[PDB]
Design a protein around this ligand. Structure first.
Ligand SMILES: CCOP(=O)(COc1ccc(C[C@H](NC(=O)O[C@H]2CO[C@H]3OCC[C@H]32)[C@H](O)CN(CC(CC)CC)S(=O)(=O)c2ccc3ncsc3c2)cc1)OCC
Lengths: 99, 99
């Protein structure tokens, strides 16, 4: 579809067998999701933005479905205030900016 | 144009007569630029991101040209890790997400 930017671009995603709301975020290199107890191994990581860094758990080869579009890649889990879909997955669903 | 997301969506902007590079950021409500001298009045504001809140200077009704497209609106100035163009100006230049 086409998403205007008057409001936050929030969509439904499916991950680890759960549905959630997440921001389609062209300023996010990586995908960062709210605390959730995903199975499997993970690597510690720190990601930075406005205000500083947070500590997150990096899980690899995670399947996420975004508005029916499937994607698989790296997902970071940590105390983010919002579920964020970053470019690593946005590219995979064919998402572009257009003006 | 149509901008893909394999790399960061960086563009040249012109503000207060100066050229700079900035990130088109659909996850940003507001536009935040690194410390710089802008003419006119400003008021202190706080904004929050992934790592907490920072103090910024709020400039209203500022002219800014984004990849050839003119906007006039609110620009925050402060210790952001990178210059970001948020939805308040993305809307003005007619930017949408498409997949
Ligand atoms: C409301 C909940 O609480 P809250 O008020 C704000 O919550 C939010 C927290 C984060 C966002 C998303 C964030 N937007 C943001 O900073 O926007 C500011 C400006 O406009 C306002 O609108 C929303 C907030 C205000 C960017 O889109 C993405 N970021 C990178 C950019 C940093 C400038 C480029 C470096 S990233 O997230 O840091 C990030 C993501 C993946 C990644 N992979 C490797 S690095 C790395 C870094 C949106 C809302 O904060 C109090 C705790």
């Amino acid at each position: 579809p086409q998403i205007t930017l008057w409001k936050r671009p929030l969509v439904t995603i499916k991950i680890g067998g759960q549905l959630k709301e997440a921001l389609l975020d062209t300023g996010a290199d990586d995908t960062v999701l709210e605390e959730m107890n995903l199975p499997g191994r993970w690597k510690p990581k720190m990601i930075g933005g406005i205000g500083g860094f947070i500590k997150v758990r990096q899980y690899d080869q995670i399947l996420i479905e975004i508005c029916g579009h499937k994607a698989i890649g790296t997902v970071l889990v940590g105390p983010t205030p919002v579920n964020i879909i970053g470019r690593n997955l946005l590219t995979q669903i064919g998402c572009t900016l257009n003006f």
